[PDB]
Every structure is written in C-alpha cells, then in structure tokens.
Design a protein around this motif. Structure first.
Motif, PDB file in Angstrom:
ATOM      1  N   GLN A 219       0.698  -1.066  -0.516  1.00 39.19           N
ATOM      2  CA  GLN A 219      -0.077  -0.382   0.450  1.00 39.19           C
ATOM      3  C   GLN A 219       0.747   1.314  -0.114  1.00 39.19           C
ATOM      4  N   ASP A 220       2.331   1.008   1.075  1.00 36.33           N
ATOM      5  CA  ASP A 220       3.034   2.127   0.729  1.00 36.33           C
ATOM      6  C   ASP A 220       3.717   2.613  -0.507  1.00 36.33           C
ATOM      7  N   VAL A 221       4.097   1.120  -0.804  1.00 41.69           N
ATOM      8  CA  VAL A 221       4.568   1.917  -2.595  1.00 41.69           C
ATOM      9  C   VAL A 221       3.029   2.662  -3.698  1.00 41.69           C
ATOM     10  N   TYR A 222       1.811   1.818  -3.208  1.00 41.91           N
ATOM     11  CA  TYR A 222       1.390   2.197  -4.502  1.00 41.91           C
ATOM     12  C   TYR A 222       1.286   3.692  -4.068  1.00 41.91           C
ATOM     13  N   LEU A 223       0.643   4.451  -3.090  1.00 42.53           N
ATOM     14  CA  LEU A 223       1.070   5.550  -2.629  1.00 42.53           C
ATOM     15  C   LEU A 223       1.772   6.168  -3.102  1.00 42.53           C
ATOM     16  N   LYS A 224       2.810   5.624  -2.806  1.00 48.00           N
ATOM     17  CA  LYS A 224       4.368   6.680  -3.565  1.00 48.00           C
ATOM     18  C   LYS A 224       3.937   6.646  -5.360  1.00 48.00           C
ATOM     19  N   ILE A 225       3.787   5.889  -6.260  1.00 49.20           N
ATOM     20  CA  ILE A 225       3.776   5.859  -7.498  1.00 49.20           C
ATOM     21  C   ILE A 225       2.614   6.541  -7.714  1.00 49.20           C
ATOM     22  N   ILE A 226       1.554   6.695  -7.360  1.00 48.16           N
ATOM     23  CA  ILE A 226       0.755   7.976  -7.251  1.00 48.16           C
ATOM     24  C   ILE A 226       0.902   8.932  -7.355  1.00 48.16           C
ATOM     25  N   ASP A 227       1.272   9.389  -6.313  1.00 49.18           N
ATOM     26  CA  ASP A 227       2.244  10.580  -5.879  1.00 49.18           C
ATOM     27  C   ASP A 227       3.122  10.957  -7.287  1.00 49.18           C
ATOM     28  N   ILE A 228       4.071   9.921  -7.446  1.00 46.38           N
ATOM     29  CA  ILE A 228       5.287  10.600  -9.063  1.00 46.38           C
ATOM     30  C   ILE A 228       5.037  10.478  -9.786  1.00 46.38           C
ATOM     31  N   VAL A 229       3.592   9.742  -9.859  1.00 48.33           N
ATOM     32  CA  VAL A 229       2.570   9.926 -11.310  1.00 48.33           C
ATOM     33  C   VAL A 229       2.465  11.168 -11.721  1.00 48.33           C
ATOM     34  N   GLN A 230       1.589  11.445 -10.431  1.00 48.81           N
ATOM     35  CA  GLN A 230       0.425  13.096 -10.454  1.00 48.81           C
ATOM     36  C   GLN A 230       1.607  14.244 -10.256  1.00 48.81           C
ATOM     37  N   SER A 231       2.810  14.063  -9.863  1.00 51.97           N
ATOM     38  CA  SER A 231       3.907  15.250  -9.703  1.00 51.97           C
ATOM     39  C   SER A 231       4.489  15.760 -11.264  1.00 51.97           C
ATOM     40  N   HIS A 232       4.743  14.323 -11.888  1.00 55.28           N
ATOM     41  CA  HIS A 232       5.172  14.861 -13.141  1.00 55.28           C
ATOM     42  C   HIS A 232       4.600  15.636 -13.779  1.00 55.28           C
ATOM     43  N   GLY A 233       3.212  15.462 -14.262  1.00 56.50           N
ATOM     44  CA  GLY A 233       2.141  16.171 -14.938  1.00 56.50           C
ATOM     45  C   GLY A 233       1.610  14.993 -15.604  1.00 56.50           C
ATOM     46  N   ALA A 234       1.373  13.213 -15.395  1.00 59.52           N
ATOM     47  CA  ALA A 234       1.035  12.901 -16.292  1.00 59.52           C
ATOM     48  C   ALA A 234      -0.363  12.486 -14.818  1.00 59.52           C
ATOM     49  N   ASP A 235      -0.965  11.007 -15.926  1.00 57.79           N
ATOM     50  CA  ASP A 235      -2.268  11.265 -14.808  1.00 57.79           C
ATOM     51  C   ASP A 235      -2.872   9.152 -15.385  1.00 57.79           C
ATOM     52  N   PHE A 236      -3.157   8.555 -15.319  1.00 57.30           N
ATOM     53  CA  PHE A 236      -3.537   7.036 -15.329  1.00 57.30           C
ATOM     54  C   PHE A 236      -4.967   7.272 -16.502  1.00 57.30           C
ATOM     55  N   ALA A 237      -4.479   6.315 -17.562  1.00 56.02           N
ATOM     56  CA  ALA A 237      -5.339   6.029 -17.980  1.00 56.02           C
ATOM     57  C   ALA A 237      -7.034   5.466 -18.025  1.00 56.02           C
ATOM     58  N   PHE A 238      -8.070   5.694 -17.948  1.00 51.73           N
ATOM     59  CA  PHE A 238      -9.379   4.975 -18.354  1.00 51.73           C
ATOM     60  C   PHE A 238      -9.331   4.291 -19.880  1.00 51.73           C
ATOM     61  N   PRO A 239     -10.193   3.163 -19.793  1.00 48.58           N
ATOM     62  CA  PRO A 239     -10.833   2.907 -21.275  1.00 48.58           C
ATOM     63  C   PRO A 239     -11.180   3.866 -22.110  1.00 48.58           C
ATOM     64  N   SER A 240     -10.663   4.131 -23.705  1.00 51.40           N
ATOM     65  CA  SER A 240     -10.636   5.488 -23.881  1.00 51.40           C
ATOM     66  C   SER A 240     -11.546   4.924 -25.524  1.00 51.40           C
ATOM     67  N   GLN A 241     -12.343   5.064 -26.405  1.00 47.79           N
ATOM     68  CA  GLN A 241     -13.030   5.169 -27.525  1.00 47.79           C
ATOM     69  C   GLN A 241     -12.670   6.491 -28.107  1.00 47.79           C
ATOM     70  N   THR A 242     -12.373   6.466 -29.856  1.00 45.34           N
ATOM     71  CA  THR A 242     -12.703   7.097 -30.417  1.00 45.34           C
ATOM     72  C   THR A 242     -14.148   7.149 -31.298  1.00 45.34           C
ATOM     73  N   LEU A 243     -15.038   8.412 -31.238  1.00 43.85           N
ATOM     74  CA  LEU A 243     -16.445   8.181 -31.780  1.00 43.85           C
ATOM     75  C   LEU A 243     -16.476   8.687 -33.287  1.00 43.85           C
ATOM     76  N   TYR A 244     -16.822   8.267 -33.397  1.00 50.39           N
ATOM     77  CA  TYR A 244     -17.663   9.063 -35.581  1.00 50.39           C
ATOM     78  C   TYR A 244     -19.427   8.672 -35.033  1.00 50.39           C
ATOM     79  N   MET A 245     -19.446  10.581 -34.928  1.00 47.38           N
ATOM     80  CA  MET A 245     -20.553   9.971 -35.156  1.00 47.38           C
ATOM     81  C   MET A 245     -21.903  11.258 -36.304  1.00 47.38           C
ATOM     82  N   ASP A 246     -22.479  10.363 -36.735  1.00 45.20           N
ATOM     83  CA  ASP A 246     -23.417  10.987 -37.795  1.00 45.20           C
ATOM     84  C   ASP A 246     -23.737  11.653 -38.214  1.00 45.20           C
TER      85      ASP A 246
END
Ligand SMILES: CCCCCCCCCCCCCCCCCCCC(=O)O[C@H](COC(=O)CCCCCCCCCCCCCC)COP(=O)(O)OCCN
Ligand SMILES: CCCCCCCCCCCCCCCCCCCC(=O)O[C@H](COC(=O)CCCCCCCCCCCCCC)COP(=O)(O)OCCN
Ligand SMILES: CCCCCCCCCCCCCCCCCCCC(=O)O[C@H](COC(=O)CCCCCCCCCCCCCC)COP(=O)(O)OCCN
Ligand SMILES: CCCCCCCCCCCCCCCCCCCC(=O)O[C@H](COC(=O)CCCCCCCCCCCCCC)COP(=O)(O)OCCN
Ligand SMILES: CCCCCCCCCCCCCCCCCCCC(=O)O[C@H](COC(=O)CCCCCCCCCCCCCC)COP(=O)(O)OCCN
Ligand SMILES: CCCCCCCCCCCCCCCCCCCC(=O)O[C@H](COC(=O)CCCCCCCCCCCCCC)COP(=O)(O)OCCN
Ligand SMILES: CCCCCCCCCCCCCCCCCCCC(=O)O[C@H](COC(=O)CCCCCCCCCCCCCC)COP(=O)(O)OCCN
Ligand SMILES: CCCCCCCCCCCCCCCCCCCC(=O)O[C@H](COC(=O)CCCCCCCCCCCCCC)COP(=O)(O)OCCN
Lengths: 246, 246
Positions: A219-246
């Motif tokens: 748990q300690d390592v995971y929280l530190k990882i979250i802090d490191i990722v967010q402090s560098h300007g990045a973020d975790f990715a959700f599942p993503s899609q590209t939608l083409y609408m009529d």
C-alpha cells in the motif's frame, strides 16, 4: 476347528464394535462379509484335501483375484502413497501448500495413512486422498523466502514524452524504500503498447514474508507511485474510445 | 442332485421375488441368468470327472474370467469404497459437504454400501457412487469454525488522497464490531489498481457459523462501510471511459 476359531474371533470383533457404538444392521452385515471372504479363502486353500481338480479352482481363484485386484486399486494406492509420505514428505504440519493442478490450498493440519487433512483459508477442513501427492506438483508458499510486488502503471498516450523520467523516478523510489529487498530482482520498464495506455511494469520483492506487513508495504509503494505519477504532470488512463458521430 | 438342489433354491428365490412384487418376465430372465451362471461354474469345476483335457478348460475359463473381471470393475469398486467409508469416513450423517472436483454439494442423508444419498440445497435427492470418495477431495463446511466476510471497496481515482484515512477508518470499525472474531485474520488494505477504481480489500471472520446470523452481520458491516466512505467525501466508482469525439 479352524473355522470355529475364526468365527469366534470375528464374533468377538463384532461385539467390540457394537460396544464401541455402531448400527446393529451394519455390524451384522460386516460380520457376514467377513464370514464369506474367510470361507472363500479357506476353500481356495483347502481345495484338494476334500476338494476338486486343481484346474477349475485355479481358474475360479484367478478370475476372482483379478476382479478384486482391479476393483481395489485406488484404496491400496492411497495407502501406498501414505507410506511414501511417511518416509518422504515435501511438507510438514502447519505450512501452507498449493498446487497448479488441483485445488488443495490451505495449511496442512494432519497427515494420515489414507488422507491428508488441510485447513482451508475460510476455516474449513478439506480431506485430500494421498495418491494425489504422487502425481501432481506441490508448491509450498509456507517456505517462501520473499513476497513479491508486481503491478502495471498505465499512462495516457499523451504522456509519452514523460515516460522515461517517470520510470527513473519510480526506480529511485524503490531503491531507497526500507521495505524492499535490494538483493532480489528490481525491474521498472516501459514494456507494452496497450489498447488505451502505455504500460510500465513494476516488479520487486519485500524483505518480510508476513501477510499484513507485505500488504502494508505494498500500500505504501502504491501511494508513492500515485504521487510520483501525478507530480510529473501525467495521469492514469481510463479505457478510451474514438467515436464518429453522424 | 447338486444341480437339482440349486435349481430348487433359485426357483424358491424367484417365487419369493414374485411374492414381494416384481415383473414376472424380468424375474424369469433373472432366474435364467442364474441358471446359466451356475451351470458354467459347475462345468468349470466338474470338468474332469466326465469332462475334457485341463488345457482347453483352463483357456476358456481364463478368457471368461478376464472379461468378467474387467466388466465388473466399477460395481465392485463402488462396494469396496462403501466398505472403506464404513471403516474410515470423512463425514457423518447430517453435515454439509462439498468438492472442488465434482458437484456433490448438499447435506449427507444416508450412507450405503454402493451409493451415498445427499440432500441438495434445492431439496432434491442426489445419489453419489461411493468410488468417487476414493479419488476426489472432500470439503466439510458443516465442520467450519468461522464464516468469512470478504469484499472490495472500489474508490474513484480522484479519491486517492482520501484512501489512507478511509482504510484506517474501516479497520477501526472492524475492530470494535461485536460480531467480528478478533482472534482471526483481519485485513484492510489498498492493494489494486483496477481499470476504473482503486481497490481496497476487506477480509475478516465472524464469530458465528449460522447462515442467517452471518448474513445479518455482513449486511450491517456493508452499510457501515457505505456510511464511512460517504462521510469522508469519497464515492464508489462506476465503470469509466474517456471518449474522443470528432
Ligand atoms: C460371481 C459373482 C456373483 C455376484 C456376487 C454375489 C452377490 C449376491 C449377494 C447377495 C446376498 C444378500 O443380499 O443376502 C442378504 C444379505 O446378506 C448380506 O449380508 C450380504 C452379503 C454380501 C456378500 C458379498 C459376497 C462376498 C464374496 C467374498 C469373496 C471375496 C440376506 O438377507 P438377510 O436375511 O440377511 O436380510 C437382512 C435383513 N433382514
Ligand atoms: C470368488 C467368488 C465368491 C462368490 C460369493 C458368492 C456367494 C455370496 C452370496 C451368497 C451367500 C450369502 C450368505 C448368507 O447370507 O448367509 C448367512 C450365513 O453366513 C455364512 O456364514 C454363510 C457362508 C456362505 C459361504 C458360501 C461361499 C461359497 C463359495 C464357493 C446368513 O446367516 P444369518 O444368521 O444372517 O441368516 C439369517 C438372516 N436371513
Ligand atoms: C509389498 C509392499 C507393501 C508395503 C509394505 C512394505 C513397505 C516397505 C517400506 C520401505 C522401507 C524404506 C525405509 C527407508 C528408510 C530411510 O532412511 O529412507 C529415507 C526415505 O527414503 C525414501 O525416499 C524412501 C521412500 C520409500 C517409499 C515406500 C514405497 C511404497 C511402499 C509400498 C531416506 O533415506 P536415507 O537413508 O537417505 O535417510 C536419511 C535421511 N532421512
Ligand atoms: C488376498 C488378496 C487381496 C487382493 C487385494 C485386495 C485389495 C482391497 C483393498 C485393500 C486395502 C487395505 C488397506 C489397509 C488397511 C489399513 C488399516 O486397517 O489400518 C489403518 C492404518 O494402516 C496402515 O498403517 C496403512 C496400511 C499400509 C497399506 C497396506 C500395505 C499392504 C497391502 C495390504 C493388502 C494386500 C493385498 C488404520 O489407520 P487409518 O487409515 O484410519 O489412520 C489414518 C487415517 N487417515
Ligand atoms: C462367447 C460369448 C458369446 C455371446 C454370449 C451369449 C449371448 C447370447 C444369449 C442369448 C439368449 C437369448 O436371448 O435367449 C432368449 C432369452 O434368454 C434369456 O433369458 C437370456 C439369457 C442370457 C444369458 C447370458 C449368458 C450368461 C453366461 C454366464 C457366464 C458368466 C430365449 O428366448 P425365450 O424363448 O426365452 O424368449 C422369451 C420371450 N418369450
Ligand atoms: C463363459 C462362457 C459362457 C457362454 C454362455 C453361452 C450360452 C448362453 C446363451 C444360450 C443359452 C440360453 C439358455 C436358455 O434360454 O435356456 C432356458 C433353459 O435354461 C437353462 O437352464 C439352460 C442352460 C444352458 C446352459 C448352457 C451353458 C453352456 C456352457 C459351455 C430356456 O428355458 P425356458 O423354460 O425359459 O425356455 C422356454 C422359453 N423359450
Ligand atoms: C478380498 C477382500 C474383499 C472385502 C472383504 C473383506 C473386508 C475386510 C475389511 C478389513 C477390516 C478392517 C478392520 C479395522 C478395524 C479398526 O479399528 O480400524 C479402524 C479403521 O481403520 C481403517 O482405516 C481401515 C480401512 C480399511 C478399509 C477396507 C479396505 C477395502 C476392503 C476391500 C481404525 O483403526 P484403529 O485400530 O486405530 O481404530 C480405532 C478407532 N475406532
Ligand atoms: C467368481 C468370479 C467373479 C468375478 C467378478 C465378478 C464381479 C461382478 C460384480 C460383483 C458385485 C458384487 C456386489 C456385492 C453384492 C451386494 C449385496 O447383494 O448386498 C448389498 C450390501 O452388501 C454388502 O454389504 C456389500 C458387499 C461387499 C462388497 C463385496 C466384497 C467381496 C467381493 C464379491 C465379488 C468377488 C468376485 C445389499 O445392500 P445394498 O447395497 O442394497 O444397501 C446399500 C445401498 N446403497
């Protein structure tokens, strides 16, 4: 006189069973089974003094023994594996065992001649035939030397230019963490193009083998990882899609 | 005279079967089967007083016995396992048993020489051949010492800064709950990056083993968990996506 002595002996055995406490009918039926098997064996042995030609008796005994040999294979196999476990055992009482072939997971509670009793992790008894231990691979997590931490950091595809530094940062955090075993494998690398993210693997070991201590360190390592990722300007990715609408 | 006596005996048996109540045709066929088997056995035994050379008879009897022995393996195996269960049984009448290898789940109703009768949880009888108990692992939930509560709390990725405190709060709630067994495993930790949520494991045991009491305690714990999570400003996460539109 031999038959009389055997009948008296088994009758005493049946009376002892009844005194110990058991059903009337079951005890009588068991005694009758012993009667019949003893008589068959004795006739097979006394088949010449008052018996018949030693060719029909040979065939009858051979057929009977052959059927009995195939029918009783599994029970005898369990008892043979019990003897084997008595002499050569890959585990002891009280350690946690596992198998990739069958579900036997739990802590060994008792080792018997026919079955092994294991306490599962929901506090239930499980009785495993001994013959299984002669054909499946057995793992012993109770004898482990380290607990492993493995995870994946999935960054957004727009964070590619920040992958490198982030990896370095995470690696540094793992090399100064007091709970991480520095003599074991320690890997942090970007190694996968996923559907919606760029994946960085984390792979290390803790010094402790205790369940709660390992979970707390993780748990300690995971929280530190979250802090490191967010402090560098990045973020975790959700599942993503590209939608083409009529 | 021996053949006449045997024929009279089996005819009395057939008449007794008819009196007990059975199809007359099936009884006649069974009696004919006993005829033929008895005649074959007697000829195999009386094959020298008026019979033939003891080399063809040996071969004929050997082939017959080999076929009969392999064909009757399963029935005899069931009865041998019944004897084993009579002497060494991992369960008693009335307790709930299970297996990870086959579907035998239910409460043991009767233990016979050939099959075991089990009442399933939808109130149906199930007849299990006894030989299965010589080769599969049998669990006995009827002998459990505790019931287990396990669950996952999935928080939103925006609630990371509130993970720690929440974990502590939940742990505290579990250590003061009157229904939780404090001498067993009690773990609350953030241990997983999921696709849409940060996952916290909850792992504990109840003192009781009664079904309804365990369910009531679990419901109480779940409602308290919801209150704790919502009072700290976090929320449960739905499946999430990032959508890019043209
Ligand atoms: C060639 C093989 C042919 C098939 C093998 C024989 C199976 C037939 C056995 C039937 C015996 C039977 O049902 O007898 C009843 C019970 O006997 C009993 O108690 C059952 C005895 C079972 C013996 C099985 C054969 C052992 C062979 C040993 C050699 C190895 C007597 O009924 P009851 O009057 O006792 O009824 C009690 C309630 N009142
Ligand atoms: C290898 C092949 C083996 C094949 C075996 C086939 C015969 C077994 C089944 C039939 C015998 C049943 C015997 C039986 O029930 O007799 C009891 C006496 O026990 C006894 O002591 C009867 C002994 C009979 C031995 C016959 C063996 C022949 C082998 C050739 C009854 O006695 P009870 O007091 O319970 O009866 C009063 C209640 N009905
Ligand atoms: C017909 C047979 C019916 C069964 C009844 C007879 C059973 C006989 C059992 C065999 C006796 C083996 C005695 C070995 C004693 C011994 O010291 O061996 C140890 C176990 O080895 C081993 O690994 C021994 C494994 C033996 C497995 C038994 C096989 C199943 C039986 C059927 C290790 O040997 P070490 O001298 O290096 O010991 C020094 C380190 N502890
Ligand atoms: C004559 C022609 C016969 C043809 C073959 C017939 C085969 C039919 C199946 C035979 C199975 C016999 C099983 C042995 C009985 C075991 C017994 O009574 O004692 C148990 C311990 O025995 C022990 O200490 C283990 C016994 C070691 C295995 C036996 C090795 C020799 C082979 C015997 C038969 C040969 C034929 C009691 O203890 P428990 O098991 O309740 O306690 C631990 C529970 N988990
Ligand atoms: C070498 C092996 C070759 C194959 C084995 C022989 C199988 C053929 C049996 C045919 C007998 C058959 O169908 O007979 C009919 C019925 O007999 C019956 O009731 C059937 C008797 C079955 C006996 C099976 C052989 C036992 C061997 C024992 C040794 C162990 C007579 O017809 P029906 O006039 O009775 O028709 C009654 C309605 N009306
Ligand atoms: C080991 C190998 C064993 C191979 C067995 C092969 C022979 C069996 C099949 C043919 C025999 C059928 C007998 C049969 O149906 O005869 C009944 C008489 O029973 C009897 O008592 C007939 C006994 C015949 C014994 C022959 C055995 C030869 C072995 C060498 C008929 O009587 P019913 O009154 O029902 O008939 C009037 C209605 N059709
Ligand atoms: C050809 C054979 C055809 C079958 C007909 C013959 C069957 C013979 C049965 C063997 C007699 C075993 C008597 C054991 C008595 C006994 O006390 O043993 C108990 C069961 O052990 C055990 O674990 C015994 C397991 C034996 C299973 C039967 C094997 C399959 C038979 C085929 C435990 O032993 P303890 O002395 O510690 O008891 C103290 C606690 N009550
Ligand atoms: C001659 C050459 C023969 C070659 C082999 C032929 C094999 C063919 C299959 C043999 C199957 C025999 C089944 C035993 C009969 C059982 C019987 O009549 O009595 C039952 C109980 O007997 C009991 O107490 C169980 C009997 C104990 C097992 C038999 C041990 C000796 C082996 C006999 C054959 C040897 C060959 C009745 O009770 P139930 O079963 O209805 O009640 C509980 C229901 N679940």
């Amino acid at each position: 006189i031999l038959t009389i002595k055997l009948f008296l002996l088994i009758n005493q055995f049946e009376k002892q069973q009844i005194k110990k406490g058991r059903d009337i009918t079951s005890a009588r039926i068991m005694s009758r089974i012993i009667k019949i098997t003893i008589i068959v064996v004795l006739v097979l042995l006394y088949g010449e003094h008052f018996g018949m030609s030693l060719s029909g008796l040979l065939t009858f005994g051979g057929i009977g023994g052959l059927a009995v040999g195939m029918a009783g294979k599994d029970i005898l196999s369990n008892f043979f594996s019990g003897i084997m476990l008595y002499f050569d055992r890959p585990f002891s009482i009280g350690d946690w065992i596992r198998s990739p072939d069958r579900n036997i997971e739990g802590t060994v509670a008792e080792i018997g001649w026919r079955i092994t009793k294991i306490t599962t992790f929901d506090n239930r008894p499980l009785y495993v035939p001994n013959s299984l231990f002669s054909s499946i691979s057995v793992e012993n997590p109770g004898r482990m030397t380290n607990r492993r931490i493995t995870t994946t950091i999935g960054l957004r595809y727009e964070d590619a230019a920040k992958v490198g530094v982030i990896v370095e940062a995470v690696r540094e955090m793992l090399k100064n963490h007091p709970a991480i075993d520095q003599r074991q494998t320690l890997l942090v690398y970007f190694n996968q193009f996923a559907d919606s993210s760029l994946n960085i693997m984390v792979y290390c070991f803790t010094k402790t083998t205790v369940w709660a201590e390992w979970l707390a360190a993780q748990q300690d390592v995971y929280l530190k990882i979250i802090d490191i990722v967010q402090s560098h300007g990045a973020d975790f990715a959700f599942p993503s899609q590209t939608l083409y609408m009529d």
